[PDB]
Amino acid sequence: MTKVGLRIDVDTLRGTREGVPRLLATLHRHGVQASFFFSVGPDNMGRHLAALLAGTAWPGKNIGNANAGIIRETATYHETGLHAWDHHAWQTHSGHWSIRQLEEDIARGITALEAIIGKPVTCSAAAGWRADGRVVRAKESFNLRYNSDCRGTTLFRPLLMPGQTGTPQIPVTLPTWDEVAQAQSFNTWIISRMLQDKGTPVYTIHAEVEGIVHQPLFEDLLVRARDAGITFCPLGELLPASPESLPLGQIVRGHIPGREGWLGCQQAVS
């Protein structure tokens, strides 16, 4: 039996409203505990040009204000953490932002999420994986249990400077749907990839996709993974008792097939 961390990205109001409760019903039926990362601030996801009315040229609606009961309900049965304040803003401008500006944005998000759920937030994940070393320094202020800011191969402590390591990093090791899409073969291929990972396999889905349109597909993936020997757990479950066991690494600006843009890429040391 093979533990695969299941991460779920929520980036829009409609993913939170309609995607998450369907995901909650599905995961409850199939005994699966997962890890949700909520975008709680403005839905400006439309500015990339229902998404046509997603803050395309006007302030977007607060996702966490408009869904504070779903979010609350999620954090009752799942590890819960912070995806973004303004997802569009982070993935578009964070690479030019000062370390103060990254700190301030993570603050805004963490506060909104703790206002909704009423308990400490222990993990986070940069929108679009738009993170690097500066984001590591900015996230060190909040001293979270772990963070999932990059694509890599296995969990690791980032090295901030010689002798000092940061808050542990739980990378996404597997490609996503939208990077590979045939649809009926994708489940069989991703299960193969989950079973042959040499690291710690962490899979990422999106509440806008696997929670809405491709919910029957993702529920099939649940069934087949149970049978091929896989069990999905929240990412934090993959940490050992001592973060000392985790290897040293960094996050650097790299590129991945299927994504247009740079993103955070785990690396080894010097």
Curated annotation (Swiss-Prot):
Domain of life: Bacteria
Record EC number: 3.5.1.n3
Induction statement: Induced by BasR.
SUPFAM superfamilies assigned: Glycoside hydrolase/deacetylase
Presence of the UniProt keyword Transmembrane in the record: no
Domain NodB homology: start-end pairs: 2-233
Pathway annotation: Glycolipid biosynthesis; 4-amino-4-deoxy-alpha-L-arabinose undecaprenyl phosphate biosynthesis; 4-amino-4-deoxy-alpha-L-arabinose undecaprenyl phosphate from UDP-4-deoxy-4-formamido-beta-L-arabinose and undecaprenyl phosphate: step 2/2; Bacterial outer membrane biogenesis; lipopolysaccharide biosynthesis
Record-level GO cellular component terms: membrane
Any one Gene Ontology BP term: lipopolysaccharide biosynthetic process
Swiss-Prot/TrEMBL keywords: Antibiotic resistance, Hydrolase, Lipid A biosynthesis, Lipid biosynthesis, Lipid metabolism, Lipopolysaccharide biosynthesis
Gene Ontology molecular functions: hydrolase activity, acting on carbon-nitrogen (but not peptide) bonds, in linear amides
EC top class named in words: hydrolase
Function statement: Catalyzes the deformylation of 4-deoxy-4-formamido-L-arabinose-phosphoundecaprenol to 4-amino-4-deoxy-L-arabinose-phosphoundecaprenol. The modified arabinose is attached to lipid A and is required for resistance to polymyxin and cationic antimicrobial peptides.
Protein name: Probable 4-deoxy-4-formamido-L-arabinose-phosphoundecaprenol deformylase ArnD
